[PDB]
Amino acid sequence: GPHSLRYFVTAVSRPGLGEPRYMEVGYVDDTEFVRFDSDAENPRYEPRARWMEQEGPEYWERETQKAKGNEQSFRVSLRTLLGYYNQSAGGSHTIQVISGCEVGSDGRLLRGYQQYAYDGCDYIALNEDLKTWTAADMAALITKHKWEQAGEAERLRAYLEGTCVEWLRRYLKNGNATLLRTDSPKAHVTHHSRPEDKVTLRCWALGFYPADITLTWQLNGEELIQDMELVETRPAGDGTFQKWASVVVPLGKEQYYTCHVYHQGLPEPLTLRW
């Protein structure tokens, strides 16, 4: 299926406490594989997935140097934004960026993207065509004009169609045993009492990969999607994911509800009852 290379970058100022904290976390699909944290003793880009051991020492030196340069770039961005927004230098502010590309099953580019946020709100984003930016406000419009005159769109587009795609292919190749695998979810249902003379039924799905999955509760063959509760799919510490979905049903009527689990590792969807 399709795959993605994504980088989450965060820069947070902290007046009176020194320089901004700068962090970079990279993911190949839903798997973390690289990281940089300026708050480390000896800040360096480091592997987060076993297969990254296949990259030589120069990879780490190169990326470490790149990270240090980005940190400085964002530190200046933080300062610049105080000017655009005319804000005081005594407050903490945050800049966020998602940058990445996605390829199809054949390793061919499907889409590229890079979006910014300042203090939790859209700032500037590259359009689908990878040729122009769209600014959320007048501050971002200034950035848009600067970047346009600097030819940034062209430089970013070259990265997204080239560098980004080429390295993603390499990452998928080197870590194929990890990234191309499929772990089937194991499911079970828990039961809990309620005051109102009814019960809570919770469907659990464990140890699966990739992260995408669907959990539903059915009655009379129809999905109760609406009246149920759930949590977002979450990592379980070993590279796999888990999720749960619950529904409140009338005591004694439990056997009338069934849980459905759809996943890449489930040839036929799982159906469970309590």
Partner: peptide, 8 residues
């Protein structure tokens, strides 16, 4: 690999 950014 990561992209090389320049200030906003």
């Amino acid at each position: 690999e990561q992209y090389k950014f320049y200030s906003v």
